Design a protein around this ligand. Structure first.
Ligand SMILES: OC[C@H]1O[C@@H](O[C@H]2[C@H](O)[C@@H](O)[C@H](O)O[C@@H]2CO)[C@H](O)[C@@H](O)[C@@H]1O
Ligand SMILES: [Ca+2]
Length: 769
């Protein structure tokens, strides 16, 4: 490996061998069907709301999130980079697809598949990833840096449906070597969204954009239809000329054939036919190819950028609504703009690399933080793009001021912005894209007094329940299978209108968003204030026994949606106390004296009673009325955690909080698989895991990272990082269970999982507060 020195990969990048088999992978631990796409994954490409494409560490374009809200795992084998090399003085060169695998059927059988093991590495530090190719049969060593321009405090380039592939080639040998790099792409119009005739009308064209000191050559893969539908638009691939390279292309090869129409050209001398052909296809799949060829002298390096764009302007949801995607603000809505997007990337990628470096540098340069922590911190952000992210720029046929936004809970539980989960998972948005965060919270504010008296069948028990109660915050803002933003509470497994945590978490999120954006946005507090007061006032009515605290009802009525709480719980009770304190402070800011006094009165009574009911001398009891009320809950002081972040001070005595956190570390972490897998949710005082429910026996990744941040703020630095380390290890390490780029909600002691690709572990960003 002599190519690594010619590029700059951070030491904190996650690494794996190209073609590496992983032996220890986990699988779902639930009885019913659950997504398991395997460990062959990688960092995604594509902006927020753009649809994303997961290119895996083996080189394949395999995890397709282009249909917004859906996860489709299938390798489109025509989509590849390939290499040709010939040493000066040899009769023949060698050609190789850079993919550690082969197609399942006979399509593309002429191509040289099965990139060998132990011949290259994949690296990832989201939004960047890299491949290096160090192969005994390839005298010139190659590397690529691939990324999309995901940039904090930037709402423009961050939306773009584009990826850059910056290639570096170096000749460490004593002979001249001819080299070619070829990007192939299938015309994927009709891959989704088209009910019949899936390839019909697809056609490919070549664009040559020549100006002074700029030559771009690109293929635009589209359809003859000018119809404005979810399925129609364009893909583009292309390259920018640099000194010392020549460009060749092939506009049309058949992907539903043996591929030799292309490969006989590339494998001879690495130079394509430059054959244009705009003939539309009928049944055959078609694709395009863009190649560069160059001679490297001994010791010579060359850099060449390729790009990929996709202009699919319309997203459709299962309920029928069609919306324009955010990037259409910048490029247009007609779906004929893929070249413009590609050109912007090829002309500006060096600026974008610097912008990414600028935001990563403050963390990467901090030598007090271990590299493993940086691996997790950056790579967990994959989910912001990969979480079915929807970001609208108008309803088709509709202009408003704002652009509504949603991130999925996950794909198994297909709900937008699940509030009990975003309480943990929304940290990156408030910290790095706060204008999105505030928009999402205003979306929630607008739902507070919505009433839908129509009744739905509750999945868990078969009871009938009212859809949406006035004054209760919704569980979610809809499902991609139905109508995001329009039809809230798509979740029907239980009735969220009786949950005891949603209204408090809502208030805490509002005050968080004010505090973490500088305590300057009084307009945001003004917009949300009525909903905050309504939310707390409705929750107060659920206090049955008049201790000042809402009562959990002994049926799941909070985020731990099978682990029943009854009476006053540490979890909902502490969240309530913190929400009351937050509302007091908002009252002071907005000069609402009567609100300040009322919430101060409620707070003093509830605080007193919480302490009396739950403090046992070592920790806070799980609740007052359950069978295992003395269980040690990892999340017992969630309200105090948020109070620390919101700078609301002590809601509980410092000594008692410190004792509780120490107990949690000693028990839920260190007595669970030697503290190497995170914090188990529930532990009995005798040091054995609480078996009352499956959720008590699970580690929740997002709960554990949040707990780590709580410990960190309280000065328990070693405990904080040790606690988080088990989550990193299970996710990313060779000794873990292979969950990179699909961090799950939970695992059990055997390491098997529930709900891969989950929003909650974005809570790791709470460690950067
Ligand atoms: O993991 C807790 C999380 O569960 C979500 O509900 C799931 C539930 O975990 C699963 O057992 C059931 O089969 O499906 C539902 C989704 O319909 C829930 O959406 C979250 O609020 C909760 O935090
Ligand atoms: Ca009560």
């Amino acid at each position: 490996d002599k190519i690594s020195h010619k590029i700059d990969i951070p030491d904190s990048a996650w690494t794996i061998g190209i073609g590496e088999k992983f032996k220890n992978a986990g699988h779902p631990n639930v009885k019913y069907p659950m997504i398991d796409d395997s460990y062959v994954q990688g960092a995604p490409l594509g902006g927020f709301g753009a649809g994303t494409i997961g290119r895996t560490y083996n080189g394949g374009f395999s995890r397709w999130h282009l249909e917004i809200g859906k996860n489709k795992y299938t390798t489109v084998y025509a989509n590849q980079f390939s290499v040709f090399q010939k040493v000066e003085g040899n009769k023949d060169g060698v050609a190789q697809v850079l993919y550690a695998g082969e197609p399942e059927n006979g399509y593309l059988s002429s191509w040289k598949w099965d990139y060998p093991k132990e011949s290259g590495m994949y690296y990832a530090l989201y939004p960047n990833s890299w491949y290096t190719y160090t192969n005994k049969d390839l005298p010139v060593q190659l590397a690529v840096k691939q990324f999309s321009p995901i940039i904090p405090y930037n709402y423009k380039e961050t939306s773009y449906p584009v990826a850059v592939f910056k290639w570096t080639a170096y000749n460490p040998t004593n002979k001249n070597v001819d080299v070619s790099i070829m990007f192939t792409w299938q015309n994927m119009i009709g891959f989704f969204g088209k009910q019949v005739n899936v390839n019909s009308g697809n056609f490919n064209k070549i664009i040559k954009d020549k100006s002074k000191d700029s030559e771009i050559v690109a293929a635009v893969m589209g359809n003859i239809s000018n119809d404005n539908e979810e399925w129609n638009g364009e893909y583009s691939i292309g390259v920018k000329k640099v000194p010392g390279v020549d460009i060749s292309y092939k506009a049309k090869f058949v992907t539903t054939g043996d591929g030799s129409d292309l490969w006989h050209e590339f494998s001879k001398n690495g130079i394509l036919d430059n054959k244009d052909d705009e003939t539309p296809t009928k049944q055959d799949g078609i694709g395009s190819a863009i190649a560069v060829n160059f001679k490297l002298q001994p010791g010579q390096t060359i850099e060449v950028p390729f790009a990929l764009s996709w202009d699919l302007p319309i997203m459709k949801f299962g309920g029928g609504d069609k919306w324009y995607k955010m990037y259409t603000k910048y490029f247009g809505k007609n779906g004929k703009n893929s070249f413009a997007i590609l050109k912007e990337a090829l002309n500006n990628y060096q600026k974008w690399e610097k912008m990414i470096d600028d935001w990563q540098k403050p963390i990467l340069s901090n030598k007090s933080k271990p590299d493993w922590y940086k691996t997790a911190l950056f790579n967990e952000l994959y989910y912001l793009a990969d979480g079915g992210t929807a970001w609208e720029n108008g309803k088709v046929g509709e202009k408003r001021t704002n652009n509504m936004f949603g991130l999925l809970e996950c794909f198994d539980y297909n709900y937008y912005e699940t509030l009990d989960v975003r309480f943990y998972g929304s940290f990156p948005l408030v910290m790095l894209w706060p204008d999105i965060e505030k928009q999402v919270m205003r979306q929630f504010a607008d739902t507070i007094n919505v009433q839908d008296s129509s009744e739905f069948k509750v999945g868990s028990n078969g009871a009938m329940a009212v859809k949406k109660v006035q004054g209760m915050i919704p569980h979610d803002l809809g499902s991609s299978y139905a109508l995001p933003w329009i039809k809230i509470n798509a979740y029907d497994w239980q009735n969220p209108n009786i949950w005891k945590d949603l209204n408090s978490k809502y208030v805490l999120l509002v005050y968080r968003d004010y505090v973490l954006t500088g305590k300057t946005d009084k307009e945001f507090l003004k917009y949300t204030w009525k909903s905050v007061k309504t939310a707390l006032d409705k929750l107060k009515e659920m206090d049955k026994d008049n201790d000042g605290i809402p009562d959990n009802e002994g049926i799941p009525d909070q985020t731990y949606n099978t682990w029943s709480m009854k009476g006053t719980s540490a979890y909902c009770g502490s969240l309530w106390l913190a929400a009351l304190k937050a509302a007091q402070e908002i009252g002071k800011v907005l000069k609402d004296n009567e609100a300040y006094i009322k919430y101060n009165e409620w707070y003093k009574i509830a605080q007193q009673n919480f302490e009396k009911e739950l403090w046992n001398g070592e920790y806070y009891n799980f609740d007052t009325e359950s069978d295992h009320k003395d269980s040690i809950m990892a999340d017992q002081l969630a309200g105090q955690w948020y109070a620390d972040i919101l700078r609301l001070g002590d809601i509980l005595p410092k000594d008692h909080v410190q004792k509780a956190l120490k107990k949690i570390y000693e028990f839920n972490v260190m007595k669970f698989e030697n503290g190497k897998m995170g914090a188990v949710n529930g532990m009995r005082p005798d040091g054995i895991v609480d078996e009352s429910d499956i959720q008590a026996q699970e580690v929740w990744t997002g709960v554990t990272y949040a707990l780590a941040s709580f410990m960190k703020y309280r000065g328990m630095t070693e405990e904080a990082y040790n606690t988080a380390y088990g989550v990193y290890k299970m996710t990313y390490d060779k000794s873990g269970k292979g969950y990179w780029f699909r961090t799950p909600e939970a695992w059990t002691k055997d390491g098997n999982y529930r709900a891969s690709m989950y929003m909650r572990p974005l809570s790791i960003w709470s460690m950067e507060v």
